[PDB]
Amino acid sequence: GRATKSIPPRAFPD
Structure with a gap:
């Protein structure tokens, strides 16, 4: 899910 x-x-992908 972590996106900068x-x-x-x-x-x-988290």
């Missing part, structure tokens, strides 16, 4: 608001926009 800043670049690089990286998301983790």
